[PDB]
């Protein structure tokens, strides 16, 4: 996807 | 050992499963920890292990679900109904796994972890986690179940945000991690790019304004989350 | 049946759900009575088992290193827990090898009708006995090593006689045979000698190769060199 | 692991 979520 | 018991032993087993990259067993071991502590609070080490465990288990199925969904859409546009039928059955199997994984951690959160969270750090951490796994549900559920999932995600993220704004520094990795995932929720689930950018820029700006309060300890985790905020904003703008 | 499960196997590969990929390809092989698997089906079968065993091999090596460290620390409680865990992985290792070895012995090897597929399945038999020898001890390890050498030798005889020196299956056999000597039999001179001969014989006629066939051979040959570069310096 | 086997 385009978006990065948190570690 | 059939007589293995207590958080210490099962914490160690979870660390072995992590080194082995056997994350399903790491979940199992961390669930036994949760059962042994039931009533009390997990330590920071335990909560992070629990989180790593479920993150890797669910992440494998999220990745599989995405590729299988793209193949389904490609075969659909090719008119290959027989392939589509087979892909749908296979996606449905992955969805029953996604659903069961989310249900596992959501049952721990609702029944043990959130009720026992004492500090503002812990409350935000577990409320963020609850919204995270409702968000993974909203990624593939449909109809009423998707709306219910998105509503549960908003409710958990908003309640976490109220507490974080009141009790955590703008540079706190938990507060920042919540802002990041809340903005992803806006962008990916609610398809509201403007509200997503506004929230991501706000959290970034608030952190920058106080970028002398994050000291060498959390500083490293905070900058990484801030870099992810920046990167999302760039992509969502271009 | 055959084609349905081939397709399911391809989906499992995309999804990186390799345990399911093995199940699907085991169903393909059962649907093919007497006939040979196609090359496509043969390679899907190998990728499936390769990835399923590959992950337990990785886990086993990590857990074994941890076991030794906790022993060096006198943490006998940890050592016991680790041994129970390593034992669980070895059980899975043993069961995965058993599945492909039974399939090779009862269906694939008997059905192989050309030197191409004969070398491929014999090599694969040796491979999975070799994966047994990586962790087995005592008589089970001795048995594994004896079956590996016999599988690889039979493969090599057919391969020298009926496959071009540049054939990736013959080269792969040489590669894995050499690794067997280096790692399992602790015969580094013989490992090096085998790998070197197989390499020289391949560069000899490396001119006949085209474009699709050149990338396939050159890949294996570079792995042969990489081992030699390290083995020759110890 | 030092050695590599066939892909
Ligand atoms: Na603990
Ligand atoms: Na649970
Ligand atoms: Na708690």
Author numbering:
A (entry chain L), D (entry chain K): 1169 to 1175
B (entry chain B): -1 to 236
C (entry chain A): 4 to 237
Question: Which lines from the publication concern this structure?
Answer:
Brassinosteroids (BRs) are vital plant steroid hormones sensed at the cell surface by a membrane signaling complex comprising the receptor kinase BRI1 and a SERK family co-receptor kinase. Many phosphoproteins of the BR signaling pathway, including BRI1, SERKs, BKI1 and BZR1/BES1 can associate with 14-3-3 proteins. In this study, we use quantitative ligand binding assays to define the minimal 14-3-3 binding sites in the N-terminal lobe of the BRI1 kinase domain, in BKI1, and in BZR1 from Arabidopsis thaliana. 14-3-3λ and 14-3-3 ω isoform complex crystal structures reveal that BKI1 and BZR1 bind as canonical type II 14-3-3 linear motifs.
We found the C-terminal 20 amino-acids in 14-3-3 ω to be disordered and thus crystallized a truncated 14-3-3 ω1−237 in complex with pBKI1265−272 and pBZR1169−175, yielding better crystals diffracting to 2.35 and 1.90 Å resolution, respectively. In contrast, the entire pBZR1169−175 (RISNpSAP) is well defined in the ligand binding site of 14-3-3 ω, with the N-terminal Arg169–Ile170 peptide adopting a different conformation in the 14-3-3λ—pBZR1169−175 complex. We next made use of the high number of molecules in the asymmetric units of our 14-3-3 ω crystal form to study the structural plasticity of pBKI1265−272 and pBZR1169−175 binding. In contrast, pBZR1169−175 is not only found well-ordered in our 14-3-3 ω complex structure, but also binds in a highly similar conformation to all 14-3-3 ω molecules in the asymmetric unit, in good agreement with the high binding affinity observed by ITC and GCI. We found that the phosphorylated pBZR1169−175, but not the un-phosphorylated BZR1169−175 peptide bound the surface-adsorbed 14-3-3 ω dimer with a dissociation constant of ∼0.5 µM, very similar to the value obtain by ITC. Binding in GCI is characterized by a relatively fast dissociation rate, with an estimated 14-3-3—phosphopeptide complex lifetime of ∼1s. We found Arg136 and Tyr137 to form hydrogen bond networks with pS270 in pBKI1 and with pS173 in BZR1, respectively. Asn233 forms hydrogen bonds with the backbone of both peptides.
